[PDB]
Design a protein around this ligand. Structure first.
Ligand SMILES: Nc1nc2c(ncn2[C@@H]2O[C@H](COP(=O)(O)OP(=O)(O)OP(O)(O)=S)[C@@H](O)[C@H]2O)c(=O)[nH]1
Ligand SMILES: Nc1nc2c(ncn2[C@@H]2O[C@H](COP(=O)(O)OP(=O)(O)OP(O)(O)=S)[C@@H](O)[C@H]2O)c(=O)[nH]1
Ligand SMILES: Nc1nc2c(ncn2[C@@H]2O[C@H](COP(=O)(O)OP(=O)(O)OP(O)(O)=S)[C@@H](O)[C@H]2O)c(=O)[nH]1
Ligand SMILES: Nc1nc2c(ncn2[C@@H]2O[C@H](COP(=O)(O)OP(=O)(O)OP(O)(O)=S)[C@@H](O)[C@H]2O)c(=O)[nH]1
Ligand SMILES: [Mg+2]
Ligand SMILES: [Mg+2]
Ligand SMILES: [Mg+2]
Ligand SMILES: [Mg+2]
Lengths: 391, 392, 390, 392
């Protein structure tokens, strides 16, 4: 329950930036969204946290800093360097941390003027952008004249929760950030680094508030974080597809969490009607996902396992039929495209050819002695007898 | 029409949010995506309620949701502005049309109507009103941050985005932000409302629950197939198998007179009666012909390279069956088995035959190292049906 | 002086050093502590500057490039902006010439150039144009200086470039790949002043600049393969030393950067750690050394686990979080889906059940394949699965 | 041994026109290029008789021959002029100096000397007299286009352009339509005299026959002989091989005392004799060390992957030989053979030994599949020379 919540909370103070890696279909973004919401009490992104997600077009110029045309005057288009998503957070997490200090950072009129120009949603007019660029030069003249004891403990914890960190070209997006994402290379650490940015030339350093909880999938091995110098920075939490949630009681505890006892009585009798058709056993979908994830571990890899986001939203046996033939059996066929004696073994129907089998055998044969099976759409109670044979 | 391929799309798209109709070419995938949306939204053309786009390899992430696109102003010709793509112009359209019947936007119902005009405006946005468009966009994502999740579960329109040949583009790159939004409990109003932050404009963005995405990928090709396992969870794949049951005598009269409801039903029926009477009065001929080829293709080729039922659907006469055979599916069969003659003779069930009423005659000249290849024969008349009766 | 005896003696010999080594080793730390202890600057700025390279770091923003600059109301006057390197190379040369007086007439003119190089604000067009004239006066002055007075300049400047193998190292050092050598510095045996492309100005590296690269050499296909780059830079292999993971060495490291009162609590936490490890003060040393030998013999010598993973441990639970969330996903990333090796790296080649990180799944594949699963251990049973490595 | 390479460069200069000093790194092929130009042209500084240019991938056509630059004109009148690069400025300067001492070009010789001062002007040109530079250039090419090919076969001031790292830069981008001019048959004075116009400014251009392009080129990155098809036919290639004759005690004393020939050169002799007394009794130790490691490189990898003689050229004591060996060449030898311990041991020819004063001690562990990998060992003192003695 709170174990994955506490495990994120421990590693985000030790290493600084956690990564929830796992097979797709488990609670990676969910346990990352529930962590930042329950720690910052802010249900929508804004000042205290910002959700982004990476892709191949999420380059360096729009993440940290780059040139961006902006004039706000319908004339005299001013080619100025604008800060990306990260530098608008790390400068915000710094100047929010420079409020609670007593007398070390003597900027109490000039720091709050910089914070109100960093959280301003309306884009910056040039008569106030020259104030923002001048106060930011004051900030890195201020930071550097502060002791490390009055800079390590900055109070408000900021989070840049990112998603699909492996999907973007992570060594290119992280530019100057490739040497700043340790816990002791930030501000306030034992070895602080006021590193210099290329484009604007103004120096930069991450504050100790900003934590980067970044979820990724590791079934695509084409794009996995194999740089061995961006696995030292991050702390990698294993989020395995846990079939413990697909019980009768654990599915009743999860799916009846936010219903206010109105449709909960409808949900209770619907799950009572689902498991009465599976054989009066409370432990069906637990060992169904277990006997598939074990049988897909020994064949493909540990990482291509079926998650528990597929079967978690079933209500009746019809909804299990529409999540079997339309979400996971097309997924199981594209692991093993025209590899038929293997996909027959994942459903352990290897001796079973005809009858209540998902892949019935074609009565034809080949000229060179080959054969291929055909998918059989089953319905009714014969579908469950074709499914209970997996267990 | 409403029996299987309509009622299993509408049930699954309302449950998962996104549907991919994967299947071999020649099957009603683009058609069942087009028929379902037009019969739902009651708008036979794109525009307001739904948008039909298609993917390709020249398709950009910058032209899908958000990118820097240089526009042409009057006095400054090279002006680089950030322009929303087609998905951000249908996700914002599905949001501000659904937000006409809400009760927490009571300060800016005129501002939501003004934002809906700027999104329905097919004219290019002048820079005097583009800042009015950007001020209303950042007002919108301030308004849904103060909207409860109980009121964003039911938005009364139903907007659709039929993307066609989804698998052709770089779907991991086109769906940049959409690889974590496209889920039923990760849109607005769901159990996990996620408002991600876009790169270029810096404005937050979240797919509304009003939207639905009906992809129709093709799975005959394999280098463009959708193997992204983190993306196959977002969608809900519906295999539309090529059904030969749409090629019987009663089924061809029921499929071709439903659309053409003119006075030529007496003309089509006497022509379809004459076509099957030349086929030996076999009402299940073309059903058996497509079935005994798709099974014989499944066993030697992949199961997703099968002949669809869109080739033999538009047949009218034996002369029209001769045109759809020698020019559409027989060059297709010579493309599947390209100089593999022992297979393509077997698929047409002419394996022992090498002379006479046959599609591929054997050449009477062998090669130097023992190789031997065959030759097409343009058949006609009742000898052509005698070469088709050997398949079934 | 245990590792500056190599670094400070190779800078006076060659001019620049690349501290290459597998990650988790003090390559950035040695390169930062050496520069800070010599220039007496705890922060960058005047006497040194920290940058790093990446794939989107190009030639125009490093040394010299074109850049539009509209100040308040003027048209877009395309100024040429000097990159990071020329704002260190000119700054080392002008601070070099400011201390001596042989023929450098105009010490107020050289001081006027030094103020216009440490400007935090961007230069106004009434001040940039006089900055362009004084830079032309600088190279006309240096071109009439003897080599005996330019071979030594006391303010040793430093440009530390972390991750030097990331950026396109031939595209970055464009006019700099035949200037960084000690023989071709501004005052060496062959004083070579090359002409820069964009601004047209002459430019040569002054003999103050020491380019302290720290290349990560974990992954291949981005390392310095070109041998012209392997000659200007005198490399230093910084091996991951597990000698910093004994009891008396780890206690001496973490007390060096700590206070007086918390040092007793830090010493008590390290006594509690090695009392739970079986009174073995040589445990984390032989843990890292007998897992770096197994990585050396199978994969290669440059994918070894560093000594920055285990350096920040304070209890058995802190070793547990390092072992399961920092080096076991690292070990499963080296040998992905290759289970017969990763059992042997932990020398659990025969152990398949019990106190082992990888239990065996009970059934094999259809054609003789068998996979494992990462078992989470806790407590003294975890130590019993860790002390069998050594 | 330096005059033997000056006679080889001067032979292949007047025959071909331009030269590539290609060789493995650690050779003096930039220093041979730099000292031959200084010795022949009698100009120690890179200006007004020769020019140094380094190529890279960011080097373009606009800064090499000519492009457009803004100037310091009037305040509201910023102008884009055609500022010439380095190759156009050096070929004009070779043509202006060639016609300055010509007898038949005496029509405007008082103006050609005015054009020479503008080309040796070591600053950006003033806008009040840039049109004087433009009109004198337009006067010049009008005069050379009205002169025969008899008086242009040779010009006595021989200019040079030392191009360093010529394989780094993309030679097709910076030589747009002007790579054909470099041949002696197509220069300004051959029978195929080709005065090509330039794509900017409308100015004609043709390189004079005295401008020589002495290129230096690494050939150990990837290039062997087939990487440079756009310049492999125009340029004469000279293998500047690593000579280990410069590591003898008689040669090392003469090289370092060539520049520092003051009283401290005596202090070098008592320092160099201290080195060659710790290497045994011989003076041929560093020569045989480089020869018996360069033979063991050219027998495994390639000829031009060879260790040059510039690493060992700056040693004075055993400590500096310790710094050259463990930090510059053995971290260079480990990257020649990345994780192949059966042959990097054999380059140091200690293949029988596994430990005991070897640079690569063997780990006591074996492998599962049979892999055995060694480990670098730092040696110091008389043990290191005992490990260097077994190489020779
Ligand atoms: N209550 C509860 N819900 C869970 C849990 N795990 C997954 N879910 C539900 O499953 C759904 C999908 O999980 P999600 O986090 O989105 O997968 P994902 O890892 O992000 O998928 P991916 O493509 O990025 S790899 C979420 O809506 C979440 O509510 C869990 O442990 N507890
Ligand atoms: N009435 C009716 N027509 C059908 C049916 N299935 C296919 N068709 C016909 O097939 C024709 C084309 O099929 P279509 O859906 O467009 O193939 P497709 O999905 O585009 O094939 P692909 O190249 O993208 S892979 C249409 O003219 C349509 O009328 C059906 O079930 N009923
Ligand atoms: N006291 C002390 N600390 C060290 C030593 N070596 C490493 N460390 C610590 O380990 C941490 C990480 O070392 P660091 O230098 O940053 O690795 P790195 O070279 O940057 O790693 P990478 O960038 O190649 S991935 C540093 O913060 C430093 O405090 C050492 O020798 N002595
Ligand atoms: N006196 C003398 N010095 C030499 C000789 N060969 C090399 N050197 C010295 O060795 C140094 C290296 O030579 P250099 O020409 O700079 O290499 P390079 O061609 O630039 O190497 P690269 O750029 O291809 S990687 C020079 O500084 C020069 O002083 C020689 O034959 N005689
Ligand atoms: Mg996610
Ligand atoms: Mg289609
Ligand atoms: Mg580093
Ligand atoms: Mg050179």
């Amino acid at each position: 329950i709170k174990e994955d919540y506490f495990r994120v909370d421990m590693l985000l103070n030790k290493k600084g930036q956690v990564i929830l890696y796992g097979p797709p279909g488990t609670g990676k973004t969910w346990i990352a969204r529930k962590y930042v919401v329950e720690e910052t009490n802010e249900k929508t992104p804004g000042n205290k946290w910002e959700f982004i997600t990476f892709h191949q077009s999420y380059s360096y110029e729009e993440f940290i800093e780059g040139f961006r045309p902006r004039t706000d005057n319908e004339e005299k288009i001013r080619y100025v360097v604008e800060d990306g998503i990260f530098k608008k957070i790390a400068l915000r997490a710094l100047v929010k941390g420079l409020f609670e200090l007593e007398d070390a950072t003597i900027g109490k009129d000039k720091i709050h003027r910089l914070y109100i120009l960093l959280t301003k949603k309306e884009p910056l007019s040039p008569t106030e952008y020259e104030e923002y660029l001048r106060l930011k030069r004051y900030l890195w003249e201020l930071v550097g004249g502060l002791p490390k004891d009055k800079l390590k403990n900055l109070t408000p914890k900021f989070y840049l929760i990112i998603d699909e960190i492996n999907r973007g070209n992570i060594s290119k997006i992280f530019g100057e950030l490739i040497t700043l994402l340790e816990k002791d290379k930030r501000l306030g650490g034992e070895n602080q680094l006021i590193v210099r940015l290329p484009y604007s030339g103004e120096p930069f350093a991450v504050p100790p508030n900003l934590y980067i909880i970044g979820t990724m999938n590791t079934a695509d091995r084409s794009i996995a974080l194999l740089d061995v110098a961006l696995r030292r920075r991050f702390a990698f939490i294993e989020v395995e597809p846990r079939p413990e949630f697909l019980e009768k009681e654990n599915l009743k505890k999860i799916r009846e969490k936010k219903l206010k006892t109105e449709d909960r009585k409808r949900l209770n009798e619907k799950l009572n009607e689902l498991f009465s058709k599976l054989g009066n056993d409370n432990y069906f979908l637990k060992t169904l996902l277990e006997k598939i994830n074990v049988r897909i571990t020994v064949v493909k890899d540990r990482d291509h396992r079926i998650g528990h986001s597929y079967f978690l939203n079933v209500e009746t046996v019809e909804d299990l039929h529409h999540v079997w033939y339309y979400e996971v059996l097309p997924l199981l066929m594209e692991y093993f495209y025209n590899d038929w004696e293997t996909i027959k073994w994942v459903l352990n129907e290897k001796g079973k050819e005809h009858g209540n089998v998902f892949f019935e055998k074609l009565r034809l044969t080949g000229p060179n002695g080959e054969e291929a099976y055909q998918l059989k759409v089953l319905e009714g109670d014969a579908f469950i007898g074709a499914l209970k044979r997996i267990i």
